[PDB]
Amino acid sequence: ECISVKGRIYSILKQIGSGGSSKVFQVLNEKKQIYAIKYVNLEEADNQTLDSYRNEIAYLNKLQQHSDKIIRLYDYEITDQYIYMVMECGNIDLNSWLKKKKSIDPWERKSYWKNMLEAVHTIHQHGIVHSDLKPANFLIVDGMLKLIDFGIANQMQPGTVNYMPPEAIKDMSISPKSDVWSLGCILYYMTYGKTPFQQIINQISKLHAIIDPNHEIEFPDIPEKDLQDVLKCCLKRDPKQRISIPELLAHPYVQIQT
Ligand SMILES: COCCNC(=O)/C=C/c1ccc(Nc2cc(N)c(C#N)c(N[C@]34C[C@H]5C[C@H](C[C@H](C5)C3)C4)n2)cc1OCC#N
């Protein structure tokens, strides 16, 4: 019914998501303004997963000043029992938006890709690599994409291996380039309606398909030949050959309108 956070009451409307021991609510303040509270339950959690949330919050704070493409954290309260994070509510997560609309607008797609690049770039500058970027990681706030988390704390549902970079699958016997791949897979979805490996059902085969160069990824021709080069370059299996964020920010597809 009600939640306190640093001397401010918040009335719960609905629940949006749930995870290991966390919940994301949609709440109203006294002035009937809409927000989102991330609630975490610490009473049950390991010591190596308590400090994940500590890092998550610390970095979420650190990075407010540095970009408006990072989700806004208004205020937070943290004990040994719980965590409350007052954040933006927004309209919809990107994962739930790729499932709703079938035909994606080119102008809107570019705009989102810009946001994504900016947000990821910003975190890359402060030495963080979100080694697990999904569309679930982005929120829409009035036609503007915003990054929700840095993939330090555990992910929530309202789990796929699609966006996983080859080098990560190879790391069984991190680089900023790993996020470029994941971003590649996410822009692919926004272009060809699916991820570059969505059709493959078996997991051990799909992982092999990820690392196997002899598996060639299809790039069907598009009116935007610029978008095609981006993904092409984002999905290079060699992280040394893959395109960087700063290169992508200097790319025709981001910097030039039709
Ligand atoms: C079974 O049906 C449940 C789905 N309910 C909905 O209608 C919500 C979609 C939604 C989804 C997210 C959202 N905004 C936010 C705002 C935030 N500040 C955070 C955080 N942290 C967040 N995180 C999640 C919550 C759920 C689990 C995951 C993925 C996604 C849904 C976004 C993290 N989402 C606002 C949203 O819009 C609310 C409305 N109407």
UniProtKB/Swiss-Prot annotation:
Residue spans making up a coiled coil are none
- Name the positions where ATP binds: 16-24, 38
Domain (Protein kinase): residue spans on this chain: 10-254
Q: Which residues form the signal peptide?
A: none
The outcome of changing residue 149 to A is:
Loss of kinase activity
Where does the record place the catalytic residues? 132 (proton acceptor)
The record lists the membrane-crossing segments as none
Tissues of expression:
Present in rapidly proliferating cell lines.
What is the similarity comment for this entry?
A: Belongs to the protein kinase superfamily. Ser/Thr protein kinase family.
Describe its assembly. Interacts with TPR; the interactions occurs in a microtubule-independent manner. Interacts with MAD1L1 and MAD2L1.
Role of this protein: Involved in mitotic spindle assembly checkpoint signaling, a process that delays anaphase until chromosomes are bioriented on the spindle, and in the repair of incorrect mitotic kinetochore-spindle microtubule attachments. Phosphorylates MAD1L1 to promote the mitotic spindle assembly checkpoint. Phosphorylates CDCA8/Borealin leading to enhanced AURKB activity at the kinetochore. Phosphorylates SKA3 at 'Ser-34' leading to dissociation of the SKA complex from microtubules and destabilization of microtubule-kinetochore attachments. Phosphorylates KNL1, KNTC1 and autophosphorylates.
Q: What is this protein called?
A: Dual specificity protein kinase TTK
What's the source species for this entry? Homo sapiens
